[PDB]
Design a protein around this ligand. Structure first.
Ligand SMILES: *[C@@H]1O[C@H](CO)[C@@H](O[C@@H]2O[C@H](CO)[C@@H](O)[C@H](O)[C@H]2NC(C)=O)[C@H](O)[C@H]1NC(C)=O
Lengths: 49, 49
């Protein structure tokens, strides 16, 4: 449904466990190539993988 | 080096241990979006992940 508006840009605001799950599902569906953008809205940006 | 001639279609002739490593590295570098074609050149096609 995010591809309906052709969203090239998503800001993620989740906890230290949900960020890893969303990034793993994005990697599974393949939406991390050059052409998109992401912002991990937390203080521990290096805490995730 | 495979992006020099803009190679789109790659045949993987590897055993059941190296195919999973090549697929994991493709997913890590992000080259499994729509536009590329791959052939798992073996007999146990459903053996890999
Ligand atoms: C990566 O971040 C930049 C912002 O620093 C995004 O915008 C680019 O900004 C540079 C300026 O340093 C321009 O020269 C580029 O033309 C801009 N990109 C575009 C597409 O216009 C850039 O979009 C980001 N990358 C992605 C894939 O979103």
């Amino acid at each position: 449904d995010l591809e309906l508006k052709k969203e090239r840009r998503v800001i993620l605001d989740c906890e230290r466990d949900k960020v890893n799950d969303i990034v793993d599902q994005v990697i599974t569906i393949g939406k991390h190539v050059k052409g998109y953008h992401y912002i991990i809205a937390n203080l521990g940006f290096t805490d995730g993988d």
